[PDB]
From a paper:
[name] 1 ([name]) is an abundant nucleolar protein that forms large oligomers and undergoes liquid–liquid phase separation by binding RNA or ribosomal proteins. It provides the scaffold for ribosome assembly but also prevents protein aggregation as part of the cellular stress response. [name] has a modular structure with folded N-terminal and C-terminal domains (NTD, residues 1 to 120, and CTD, residues 240 to 294) linked by an intrinsically disordered region (IDR, residues 120 to 240). The N-terminal domain adopts a β-sheet sandwich fold and assembles into pentamers that can form end-to-end decamers.
To better understand how the CTD associates with other parts of [name], we turned to cryo-electron microscopy (cryo-EM). Using physiological conditions (pH 7.5 and 150 mM NaCl), we obtained electron density maps that allowed a reconstruction of the NTD with a resolution of 2.6 Å. Comparison to the crystal structure revealed a virtually identical fold, including sidechain orientations, except for the loop covering residues 34 to 39, which makes up the A1 tract. In the X-ray structure, it is stabilized via crystal contacts with the neighboring pentamer. In the cryo-EM density maps, the loop is too flexible for a confident reconstruction, suggesting that not only the A2 and A3 tracts but even the A1 tract in the NTD is disordered. Free CTDs attached to the disordered linker are too small (less than 9 kDa) to be resolved on their own. Interestingly, we obtained two distinct 3D classes, one with an additional density above the acidic side of the pentamer, off-center from central cavity. Strikingly, nearly all particles in this class had another NTD pentamer in the proximity. The extra density is connected to the pentamer via the A2 tract of a single NTD and can therefore not be attributed to the disordered regions of each protomer. Placement of the top-scoring complex between the CTD and the A2 tract into the EM map showed a good agreement between the unassigned density, the helical acidic region of the IDR, and the approximate location of the CTD.
Author numbering:
A (entry chain D): 14 to 34, 39 to 118
B (entry chain E): 14 to 33, 38 to 51, 57 to 119
C (entry chain A): 15 to 23, 27 to 34, 40 to 50, 57 to 105, 108 to 117
D (entry chain C): 14 to 33, 39 to 52, 55 to 119
E (entry chain B): 14 to 33, 38 to 51, 56 to 118
Write the structure that this text describes.
Amino acid sequence: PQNYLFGCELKADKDYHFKVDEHQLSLRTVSLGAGAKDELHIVEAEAMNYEGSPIKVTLATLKMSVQPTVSLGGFEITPPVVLRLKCGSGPVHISGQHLVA
Amino acid sequence: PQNYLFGCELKADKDYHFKVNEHQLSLRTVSLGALHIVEAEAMNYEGSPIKVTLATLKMSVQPTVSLGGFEITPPVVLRLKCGSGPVHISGQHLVAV
Amino acid sequence: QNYLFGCELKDYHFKVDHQLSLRTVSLGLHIVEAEAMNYEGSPIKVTLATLKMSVQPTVSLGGFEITPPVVLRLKCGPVHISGQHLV
Amino acid sequence: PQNYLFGCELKADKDYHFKVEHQLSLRTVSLGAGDELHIVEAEAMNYEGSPIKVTLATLKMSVQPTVSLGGFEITPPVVLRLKCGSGPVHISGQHLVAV
Amino acid sequence: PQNYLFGCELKADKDYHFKVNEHQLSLRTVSLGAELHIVEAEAMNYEGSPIKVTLATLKMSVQPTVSLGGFEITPPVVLRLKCGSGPVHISGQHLVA
């Protein structure tokens, strides 16, 4: 399956909507930006579950002073996908891989 | 297989039971919400319930741990050994027809 | 076939009559030590992980495969080892 | 397929460029011997063919100097750079070659 | 193929050499024994010349262990402590086919 690089930046007032016209999106790591203030950050991913109902999960919790980067080592998800932050001014960078077969 | 997103929130007084074709639960992340030990109970080789510590999180030290695809065969029970929480578990539900 | 496996480290001898896939080591300075066979047919002592309460109490092994029999022990310093039994 | 070692060094005034089926499985990003925030970024092809830059990792000596991307696969050509931090910063990983 | 346990102790003064029915070294974890330490692994590259790459950088007061999760290297391989007094423990898998 062909692999491409994928990246996006998420802030307090901005979410990412990964949409496709089989495709898969696995997240390698989530990183904190230089300008992020000293407070907690929590990343959420919304996708499809087995019961045909959209769900929310917390991808990771990052903090500047504790753990600036948290690698999910490829958190595979079927698109469409929604990435959001519930707290933190950001920016936060989600780096993943877009797999198309 | 079929890849679906799965997530749950665990507290001191709230367990989670995963029950459900072949199904698997691939945990990847356990993150502290806004000393917390997560326990997973499932079947062992010899056929009895077994309690294992999935991860330990702490606000001051490490709020999130990546299991890198900890596979479990359902049914499963996720609980918090200690700490009020909340603690968010996120992973992959694998369904094979 | 995958089964959930765990133990608390005092030694632990895992023997089944198979593969043992270590995933996580958690704290309840500590070092987790593993004994199993090498290529040259001699046992070897290796540090699976080094943990400390105040700097990090958890380590993810990401599926460290070992062929049984194996022995786990605590070199220095309770801790919990969790992983998968594969048949 | 064929598994070779790969490593490179990045600084404020030095980025690295990878040209050559070939693949780059980045494994670890480490801080060198020589307190500010460090950000390591990689840019490569997107699905629409538009070069995009993705923050590989954020490191800091006093908080955590090493990050493992567990083989983060990226198709060459690639460019790795430092958004911030004086460096030096070491990137290591695999080079996959298929005959 | 077959997998065996593998490990070594890297000293500040003494490096470790690995030589050898096709064999791989799947490095898993690098840890501190009982200052700033850096581990280096050298082997062949795609141009047929040895290279130096930093496996990890460890410090007692920040984080004394890091897991690479299957860093595969084709032998022969040389591991060495670029800096730090050590000792440093390397653990991993030796894969034989």
